[model samples]
Target: LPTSCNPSDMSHGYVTVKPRVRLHFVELGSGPAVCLCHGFPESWYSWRYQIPALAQAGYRVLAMDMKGYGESSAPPEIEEYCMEVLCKEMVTFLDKLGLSQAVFIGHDWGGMLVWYMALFYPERVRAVASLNTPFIPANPNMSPLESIKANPVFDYQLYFQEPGVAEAELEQNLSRTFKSLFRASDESVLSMHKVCEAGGLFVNSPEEPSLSRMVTEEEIQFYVQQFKKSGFRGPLNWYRNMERNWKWACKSLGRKILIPALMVTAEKDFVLVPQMSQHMEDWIPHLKRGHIEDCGHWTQMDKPTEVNQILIKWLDSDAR
Candidate 1:
């Protein structure tokens, strides 16, 4: 086992996805490649807990800082962050790393991407697992953002869709921005939902909500520094292309994930409630479900041991 399990302890490197676009990833251990993808407002740091655990369990863990998030290249155009392009980049990233296939694990938007990859580029994936996000079959009739707007909890996404608005507010104070975003309490969630319901993701003179004990002050500083370097424009652009992604995914109508799959639901995740994934079995016949009680949105960080145990068990099983 590794002595210290931190993001800085992992070996860092960059891979050329295409001509100008590049993706950055941190690597550990030596076995089957398990590519970890993080969601919105997160980086490779999101998988800090899992990397060491999985590495110790005999797997080559590659936690990637998706495009526009960490040290990866952020394209200026909004169209660049669309789901199709992002999916293509994921496949190309594996190719660049000389990996023919990998166990793709994702969280939040990253989860959505790996599910799409199973549909569009199934050859590149050995098996897939997701946290907090579910496999919702694409519907051409109703756009994704429309569904999001209809949900009160996700109103903040609408605020994010518009360029400059969210960027200005979040980038204004990166530390406060992260403090507000990465929390575990119900009160914090209610507070954020109310803010989204009224103004936007940010509130004027936003009070710093208490941090999740699972995450350290140093970790928060690491997130702030990353956003300071990369900025929020690129990350927020992922939300801007929801309609585009919806349309792109619509092309895969009637598709189902035939590969082995697992979903770890955080019991207290406000937006992605555990019940939301109840119907996933219909689309994913070969699916295993695990629930982490009392955990919130940041599942792996909030309950690292539980998440890692579920992951390692699934990986060791016949599923993978």
Candidate 2:
């Protein structure tokens, strides 16, 4: 919507990976491939701004609906969304399409995935870029779920552990759910057990138009329709992987990324603050960092121009 590539003109399709799991995606342009992974509660449309910019920049831009959202098949089991399984599909999606590797880009939960993808399948990644979410190596001793439960700031993730709870509350009103999720958060928004408590994430959330600056009503409608189709179950299940992913992370302690990587931090993001990535360079031998001073968790949407330039700059320098 920000450039010549109209969202309606995007080529939409699905790739069947191993085990018959299908991932819906939208792609544009041609050249070196760069896969865009969207965060929770949004589809490939999350990269609506990047596709046009990256395409015109002469890059083959492929954005996924992330396996359980949009038109992709949603396996009923939460185990299906674990980090190991999800990372395998990242490789299989390219394998199915005959691409050996791609530059991976992501924000939020998707950012979380790309980081793991680089770790678990570095050979299939030319480079990796994460927006907002940092590359904090999981503490080997703690169950990620336990860590979240103990951290008052992040316990909102714990609210997502119960199977039907978050989805039912979120699916009850799709618009309200998105509006609440897309809202900006400061360092204090959920700190000290405030918003994450009481009515919990979606129910007590104020659905004011906090996303007004980043997305249009039409864009909101686009996401509303996608969630209407996929519901919040699959996305919520992603959070349930803390225990499983943490175990995988434990084995990865002292492991290095060993790939060109970029960490783009949002200063205003309450959960994943810019300082969260301070030590990333220590683990990523080939690393770059960019800070978007006036941004939140929704980095790409809130500051698309900045994110676009940062990504292009990183990709061209690190991969070309």
Candidate 3:
């Protein structure tokens, strides 16, 4: 990746997504707007590879810090990070930009939120694309917390429910926390998401690949810099709102995403397997799918060429 796309060197924009919540984003190129929202433990730099690609391809790109990370405002209260609020925040972001609609793309937790945006405020989203995460409609039968509890792979999420505990442990060693989470394709077997029983997070493996295999040394330092500014507290708060999000989602149960949608899956993603998205076509009436073999959780970073091609192709081939 070019150093020009790095956080410190990139063009930045700040907008108020809510009354008190302001977000920082990286702005590149100029054309039809495309918004990029990152997931937990990551900043806008996570999309550094995609930003330039999308921008140079004649589409305006806005890669955000997503309120709680990097240069964005991080509210102390957990209630401020609910899905409902985040969905409105994304739409409000476009409102501040004076755009009625834009293509919204997200990864991990961001994928979930953007999917909600498509369902709740489809008018504000021209199209939606998700990396790794699939659009799952809310089920009135089971609560979100209970669902996570039942899945042992999500034990790390269970640990995040405690406000200070997880963040404190994670901040104690930022290098390990991030290394354990963002792994390459070969390191997928040493999954870090399942941590509660193994004691806690970042204890998954001593043999995992170097972070450099996926992102460069500069990107690693950039991630460390971002976390130092915005700790895990605000990011962890996103997981805490699952129950609240599910509650609000109940009102829109069985709603299909009417907008053009794209689901890009990583073959080696342990937490969210490609099979998980098998039924997304039933939920998103207009859906496009792509699979990146030999890729891990961080799709964009693990395989930038494939991801950019998939997204750009989808956008140019009428998904836009």
Using lDDT as the measure, which candidate wins?
1
lDDT of 1 by residue, 1-320 (tens): 12335665569989998998989999999989999999988999888888888889889999999999889999878998998999998888888778899999999989988899887888888999999999888877886757886778777777777778888888887878787778774535334455555676655535665665666688899999888777988988988887788888889878888999998899898888888898998998899988999999888777788888999999989334
For residues 190-258, write the lDDT of model 2, one tens digit per residue.
332544467666444465535555666777777888877768788888888777888887778678999
lDDT of each: 0.84, 0.81, 0.83
> At residue 289, what lDDT does model 1 achieve?
85
Question: What TM-score goes with each of the models?
Answer: 0.94, 0.93, 0.94
Clash number by candidate, in order: 0, 0, 0
How would you order the candidates by TM-score, starting with the best? Answer: 1, 3, 2
lDDT tens readout by residue for model 3, 89-112: 777888888999999899999998
Q: Over the full model, what C-alpha lDDT does candidate 3 score relative to the true structure?
A: 0.83
- Give the TM-score (vs. native) of candidate 2: 0.93
lDDT assessment of candidate 1: 0.84
